[PDB]
Amino acid sequence: SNALKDVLNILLMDEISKLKDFLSNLDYIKPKVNIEEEIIEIRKEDIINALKLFKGKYEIEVDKIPKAVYVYLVKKNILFLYPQRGTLKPQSFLVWNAIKRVL
């Protein structure tokens, strides 16, 4: 049966719509990111640049991305942070696939 395949396809497409909505919300908004006492404005462009890094690699070094940018992307459940490793990964393979399909 195609059933499990189709269920996964549901999950995959859904996450694509979700990521598209996330990214479209940035068109007229520059998020203000809170990091303790810091308040830092970031831009859609910066966010796209960081996510594009995940197009060819599942696991990305935090040193490639401004902290304000990846903190936002973690807060927003796009990425997970491994502080000890100094790396980030998509929060699921659905998120990864969506990045690769959309960016």
From Swiss-Prot:
Protein name: Uncharacterized ATP-binding protein MJ1010
Homology family: Belongs to the archaeal ATPase family.
Span of the entire protein shown here: 278 to 377 of 377
Gene Ontology molecular functions: ATP binding; ATP hydrolysis activity
Biological source species: Methanocaldococcus jannaschii (strain ATCC 43067 / DSM 2661 / JAL-1 / JCM 10045 / NBRC 100440) (Methanococcus jannaschii)
Domain of life: Archaea
Membrane-crossing residue ranges in chain numbering: none
Keywords of the record: ATP-binding, Nucleotide-binding
